[PDB]
Amino acid sequence: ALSEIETRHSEIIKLENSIRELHDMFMDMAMLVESQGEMIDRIEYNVEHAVDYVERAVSDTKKAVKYQ
Amino acid sequence: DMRNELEEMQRRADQLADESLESTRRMLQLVEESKDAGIRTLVMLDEQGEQLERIEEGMDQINKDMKEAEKNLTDLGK
């Protein structure tokens, strides 16, 4: 006993508590990071739409103005 | 009458430890460092999410502006 049992118990309890904290941290990490991922996926489609639209608009308007 | 009898004494084997104080301390230190790293990652991830949310509005505004300008120019052209 003496330092033996007290060290065993105290270190085990503290390690368990810390590990539970890490588990919760990782869960929250995963949730928020998934939200960020879907947010970027949302960005992508509108980026593509904008580039296609601007390219077509500039080409068509330049041709139309030059021909006139 | 050489009939003898005895009594017994007991000893306790050492409790389970004396290997839980060298790897243990290193384990605790590593756990603390991992906790600090996780906190820092939390903060950085929240900041990145805020920045992405900020970007979204400008993205939508530019899309709307370009679409409206193109439609107006087409309408005036014809």
Residue numbers in the entry:
A (entry chain H): 191 to 258
B (entry chain G): 6 to 83
Sentences from the paper on this structure:
The membrane-anchored SNARE (soluble N-ethylmaleimide-sensitive factor acceptor protein receptor) proteins provide the energy to drive membrane fusion in various cellular contexts, such as intracellular trafficking and exocytosis. Supercomplexes of NSF, α-SNAP, and either a syntaxin tetramer or one of two binary complexes of syntaxin—SNAP-25 reveal atomic details of SNARE processing and show how sequential ATP hydrolysis drives disassembly. NSF comprises three structured domains connected by flexible linkers—the adapter N-domain followed by the D1 and D2 AAA+ domains. Six NSF protomers come together to form the active form of the enzyme, a homo-hexamer.
